[PDB]
Amino acid sequence: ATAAEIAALPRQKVELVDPPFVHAHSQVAEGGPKVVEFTMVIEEKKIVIDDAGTEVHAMAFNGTVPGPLMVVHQDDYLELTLINPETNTLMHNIDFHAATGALGGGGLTEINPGEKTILRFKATKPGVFVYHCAPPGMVPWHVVSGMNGAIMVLPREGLHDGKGKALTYDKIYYVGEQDFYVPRDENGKYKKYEAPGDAYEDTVKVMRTLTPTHVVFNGAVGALTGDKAMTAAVGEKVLIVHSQANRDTRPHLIGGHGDYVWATGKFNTPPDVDQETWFIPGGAAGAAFYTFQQPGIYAYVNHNLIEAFELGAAAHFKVTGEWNDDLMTSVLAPSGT
Amino acid sequence: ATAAEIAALPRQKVELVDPPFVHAHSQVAEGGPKVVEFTMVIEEKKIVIDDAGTEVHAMAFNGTVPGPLMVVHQDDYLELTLINPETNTLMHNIDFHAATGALGGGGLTEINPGEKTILRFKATKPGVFVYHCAPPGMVPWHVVSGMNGAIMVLPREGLHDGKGKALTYDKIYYVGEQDFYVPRDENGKYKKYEAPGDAYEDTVKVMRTLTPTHVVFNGAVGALTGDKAMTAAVGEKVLIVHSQANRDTRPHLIGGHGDYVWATGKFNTPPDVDQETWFIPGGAAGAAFYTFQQPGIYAYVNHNLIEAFELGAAAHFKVTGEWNDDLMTSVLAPSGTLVPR
Amino acid sequence: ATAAEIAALPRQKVELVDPPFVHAHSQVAEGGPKVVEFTMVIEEKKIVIDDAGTEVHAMAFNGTVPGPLMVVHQDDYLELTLINPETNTLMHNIDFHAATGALGGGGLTEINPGEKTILRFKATKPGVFVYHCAPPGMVPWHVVSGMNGAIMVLPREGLHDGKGKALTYDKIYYVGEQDFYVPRDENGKYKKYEAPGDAYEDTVKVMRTLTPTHVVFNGAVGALTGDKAMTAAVGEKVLIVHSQANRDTRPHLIGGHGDYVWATGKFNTPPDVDQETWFIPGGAAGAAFYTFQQPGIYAYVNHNLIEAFELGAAAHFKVTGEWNDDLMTSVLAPSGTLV
């Protein structure tokens, strides 16, 4: 498209919402290509990531870890206003893995506290994609302080299976998984600090072990449970988008499956089917579609079960509806032999 | 299917066999859906996992690590009687990743010592799938104590390649890979404990390093070697099911390939072909089909070679038959002069 | 093929070049099956791998880490002369994951210093494949001392997408990624050793932690950056072959994609498309095809960004050509209240 063709397209402003929900959008595009406008404000903030009161100095797009999901259609333009408020201490930027050129946008969006910038890129490839901060010389430190999220670039005709049949979800959730590297003192207790830059050296030492102290969804142990358990009903079709900007993961729905999984996250790569556990490499997003068939509490985990049940990587779905005895029944409930 | 329709189905009782063997089955289903019956007793038992004599309190379905492979066909029902004998100390249950509902059956099968339960599920999706114990609050410790295995839900029509041509194997093996996290003392020697519970706190510390001390097939270093090597002949078609309930692996047949690999384990996902090394994420099973072309000893490994040769993840195949110099020949054997060094 | 037919095939000798470059070849085969002859000399030598002067006693096919890429077509034979010079100290051999039999050739190629051997195998399967040394009983030590590379067995009709359209690259690069395990003393300083065997017990202790001290391309931190960046132009089609003989990696082109990725490395498995980050398990090679669309500097990384930017696994591409403002533009450059 020429600059005059892009000038003539409609603009749409979107209000973002906190993960794991996703802002309003249409699965099939409503209209020709648009320039879709988003704004995120970077907040350097303390987050508490476990029930021992462990703290992280988060570097949080729109104040959440992960940052929020942006949704556009293929060949729309995503136009981001990124703001780095004067109350922050570090320079930040943004790399969209969905984008083409200038290190994903990072080369064009380096903003010191008190600056803003506006980047536009054409979303030429359909899929779910990581975005993350990447300041030269400090890249993994920002990413493993929670400065990452994902976008979804839907095909203009919505999702389809490998054979071209429509897949339409009722619900969509976004699970961002985070590896944290929290320094400990000589007694094994997690250290606290009064500014992000005070933890830097201690944290690089833990990062270089390649062994996270915590692996969590939505920024904390247990965050996607209780008030934030994800909801569905028997018969509803749910898309679960999962990202991990730095480290591999292997998502699994305990008691369910991934009926269709774009494990690579890319919708022109046909999805795998009937998955028990799928694999998303560090630096990517993936998406699984499932139709619930049984009610109950489900857990949703990274299936390194030490990562899930010792280090924090477990969420719940609460699912209403009628039990199906054909699919599963207790013929004899636990009872003396 | 209604309760009445399920009741009218034929029942078949299977006698399980120990890994890496798989109980007798038919590749193509014989007749219509069935309720296929299995029984396993859980044994908490000390096992040795290396030639030094290192000792784990295993938590073993049917007394083996891995637990045995159960084979049914798509839309059969798998009906398991699971028994937790009164000589065990812990509650156990089972989660079938092939099943739908109640945490894969875990929510409906928590048995204390002295209890049994019968779970039935419809095997709706074809593939190989992990199963493992999962007591709430203690899940990884049971699974990395060996309490996991796999099932295979064959399509009713048997296996096919991605273009629909039949793939019929002559033998099958099940390789269960287990990461173990054994505590060490102040000088670096592995510790032994009187009961499973005495090991718990020291074992969780090693688990949280995410670094196994042992990574093994069939429960111990070298278990599938020597008189326990797997075997085949030139021309024979072998399916190798591989599972890992907790941690990634990357299987490889040294001197062979995976001609067709369902790396995800799911038979409605077309298999990769011509693979050197395939990848099975923790929490899953996969399957590779190969036709042997050359005789001799092969190794089958996790191709993190430190895991294979330092931590235990290496098996052998002994293959009989004639050597094929078209496929490979030593044009000049190692030769030269005997030099000082 | 009868014995006289195999004996009558043409023999062609090919000169290797050092990674990340690849020897000249044709994408579509030229003529019928041939026996393609290569020779490699193994060098044991000390290499420096980071800006602190840390040393590895490298075990290097053809004198490089990784060893060079050999390129043949499907149903050619690859006939390698492997030479272990008398100034080396260790026995070595070679396992081609592309080959069938004898542990990939390792059982037929065990050569002490002062020996040579010639192995021929039929390249029956198309794809990129690891090769590595594997002396029984010391396999991971040789591989993590750098003794590994890859080959490419192209289909005779060249590459194609999943629909059958031809995919023809202008350029090809081979990135071999290496995990090293360098012992440290109790102050955290990397240790140095007189002879390669002197480091063996300390190095296996590091190996057993499963945590590399360094993760590098072309054998050293920074080897493919700066003035050693790989190059392309806007409009150019580039195939990037990547291998890792011992440990998983997850390549990513920062500011680009893998337009077609044979993530398994095998050309009869249809490529994934539009990839951000692909995944190559330890013990395999993979290949990504991309057409560059934007000029400027790119980084090409293992996207565990701690492995990329703390442990060494980052390369650059320098790309010439015109900026495309349709694909990306700065609507407002970084700014505070005033311009």
Ligand SMILES: O=N[O-]
């Ligand atoms: O089935 N997840 O442990």
Ligand SMILES: O=N[O-]
């Ligand atoms: O070729 N297996 O090391």
Ligand SMILES: O=N[O-]
């Ligand atoms: O986009 N690589 O960090």
Ligand SMILES: [Cu+2]
């Ligand atoms: Cu930042």
Ligand SMILES: [Cu+2]
């Ligand atoms: Cu990135």
Ligand SMILES: [Cu+2]
């Ligand atoms: Cu148990």
Ligand SMILES: [Cu+2]
């Ligand atoms: Cu599970």
Ligand SMILES: [Cu+2]
């Ligand atoms: Cu060697």
Ligand SMILES: [Cu+2]
């Ligand atoms: Cu190998």
